A paper describes a structure:
All MAGE family members contain a shared core MAGE homology domain (MHD) which is a ~ 200 amino acid long domain, which is well conserved across the entire MAGE family (individual human MHD’s share more than 40% sequence identity). The MHD domain structure consists of two highly modified winged helix WH domains WH1 and WH2 in a tandem arrangement linked by an extended β-hairpin. The biochemical basis for this activity appears to be exerted through binding to and modulating the activities of RING domain containing E3 ubiquitin ligases. Rather, each MAGE protein appears to recognize a unique region on its RING partner, suggesting that MAGE proteins are able to function as a versatile and adaptable protein interaction module.
Crystals of MAGE-A4 diffracted to 2.3 Å resolution at Diamond light source beamline I04, and the structure was solved by two wavelength MAD using SeMet derivatized protein. The electron density map is of overall high quality with the exception of three loop regions (spanning residues 171–175, 191–194 and 262–269) where the density was not of sufficient quality to build a reliable model. As would be expected given they share 64% sequence identities the MAGE-A4 structure is overall very similar to that of MAGE-A3 (1.48 Å RMSD over 209 aligned residues) with the relative positioning of the two domains being the same in both structures. The most prominent difference between the two structures is the relative conformation of region between helices α5 and α6 (residues 230–241 on MAGE-A4) and the positioning of the extended N and C termini. In MAGE-A4 the C-terminus is more closely associated with the rest of the molecule and forms a longer section of α-helix, which packs against the first and third helices of WH1. In contrast, the N-terminus of MAGE-A4, which includes 16 residues that were part of an uncleaved purification tag, is extended and forms an interface with neighbouring molecule related by crystal symmetry. Nevertheless, it is possible to identify three possible hydrogen bonds and two buried aromatic residue (Tyr -4 and Phe -3). In the case of MAGE-A4 this is unlikely since the interface is formed from residues in a purification tag, which are not part of the biological MAGE-A4 sequence. Analysis of cleaved MAGE-A4 constructs by sedimentation velocity analytical ultracentrifugation reveals a single species with sedimentation coefficient S of 1.46 (Sw20 of 2.34), consistent with a compact globular species with a molecular mass of 23360 ± 1937 Da, which matches very closely to the theoretical mass of MAGEA4, and the calculated hydrodynamic properties of the monomeric model (Sw20 2.43) using the program HYDROPRO.
Residue numbers in the entry: -14 to -8, -4 to 0, 101 to 171, 174 to 191, 194 to 262, 269 to 312
The structure:
C-alpha cells in the first residue's frame, strides 16, 4: 500500500480570524435587526440562529448581546423581549421619531445623544458644545455621515421642524423642544445615560472559552 507520508494550515491565523468572524457577525446581526425594526416584525432566537449565525450558534449570547448594545447606543433601538425567545424592537425612551422617510438607519440614537448633551449643560447647550460631543463620535458639520446624513441639516432643520429641538440666536444654542418634553424627560434621558454607562460589558470569547459552551 505504501505512499508519501510527510507533514496546516499552509499557515493561517485561526484565532484572529475568529474574533473578526464574530465581529462581522455582530455587524450582520445588527443590520438584520434594523431590518426587522423597519418591517415591524417580531424576531425569534431560532430565526437568528438559522439566518445569521448558523455557523456560530453557541455564541448567540455574545453576538446578540453586542448587536443589541449597538442598536441601543448607536441607533436608539431597544431589543425588547416579550416573555418565548421572541423579541420586539422599539425606539428607546418611547420616542416617536426614527428618521426613516434614509429608510435604512434610525437616527433616534443620535437624537437621544443630542438631548442628553443639552440635559447635561442644564437648560440650554451652545452650538459649540453640541459640535464637540458630536465630534467625539465622528459627526462633523458639513460632512455627510453615512449612518446619520448631513448633521447640520439634521440638527438645525429636521429636528427643529419636528419640534424635538429649538435653535436660536441667544453665539447660538439648542434646547429641548415641546415634543421632546412631551415624549420624554431630562430625568429619563439622564437615567438612560446612567443605565448605559453602568451596563455589563460583553467580552468576545477566545477560541478555547467558546469551545467550552458544548
Amino acid at each position: 500500500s505504501g505512499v508519501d507520508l510527510g507533514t496546516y494550515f499552509q499557515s493561517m491565523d485561526a484565532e484572529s480570524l475568529f474574533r473578526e468572524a464574530l465581529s462581522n457577525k455582530v455587524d450582520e446581526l445588527a443590520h438584520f435587526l434594523l431590518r426587522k425594526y423597519r418591517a415591524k416584525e417580531l424576531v425569534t432566537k431560532a430565526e437568528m440562529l438559522e439566518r445569521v449565525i448558523k455557523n456560530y450558534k453557541r455564541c448567540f449570547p455574545v453576538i446578540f448581546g453586542k448587536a443589541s448594545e449597538s442598536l441601543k447606543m448607536i441607533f436608539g433601538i431597544d431589543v425588547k423581549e416579550v416573555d418565548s425567545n421572541t423579541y420586539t424592537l422599539v425606539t428607546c425612551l418611547g420616542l416617536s421619531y426614527d428618521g426613516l422617510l434614509n429608510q435604512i438607519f434610525p437616527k433616534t440614537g443620535l437624537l437621544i445623544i443630542v438631548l442628553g448633551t443639552i440635559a447635561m449643560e442644564g437648560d440650554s447647550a451652545s452650538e459649540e458644545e453640541i459640535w464637540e460631543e458630536l465630534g467625539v463620535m465622528g459627526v462633523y458639520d458639513g460632512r455627510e455621515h453615512t449612518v446619520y446624513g448631513e448633521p447640520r441639516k439634521l440638527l438645525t432643520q429636521d429636528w427643529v421642524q419636528e419640534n424635538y429641538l429649538e435653535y436660536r440666536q441667544v453665539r447660538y444654542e439648542f434646547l429641548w423642544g415641546p415634543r421632546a418634553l412631551a415624549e420624554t424627560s431630562y430625568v429619563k434621558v439622564l437615567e438612560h445615560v446612567v443605565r448605559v454607562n453602568a451596563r455589563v460589558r460583553i467580552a468576545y470569547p477566545s477560541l478555547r472559552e467558546a469551545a467550552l459552551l458544548e
